[PDB]
Design a protein that fits this description.
The chain is an alpha+beta fold and about 35 residues long. The chain contains one helix and two strands, in the order ββα. The structure holds zinc ion. It is classed as transcription.
């Protein structure tokens, strides 16, 4: 439960891909979903 992002999986915004350690997940979005501005 309530913890320092130890026991919690975050889901992707674009797709429904969730993986532990959201900290790293951030990359996926950029990789799998490389958007430009
Ligand atoms: Zn994704």
């Amino acid at each position: 439960g309530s913890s320092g992002s130890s026991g919690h999986l975050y889901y992707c915004s674009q797709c429904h891909y969730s993986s532990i350690t959201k900290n790293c997940l951030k990359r996926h979005v950029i990789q799998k979903h490389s958007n430009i501005l």
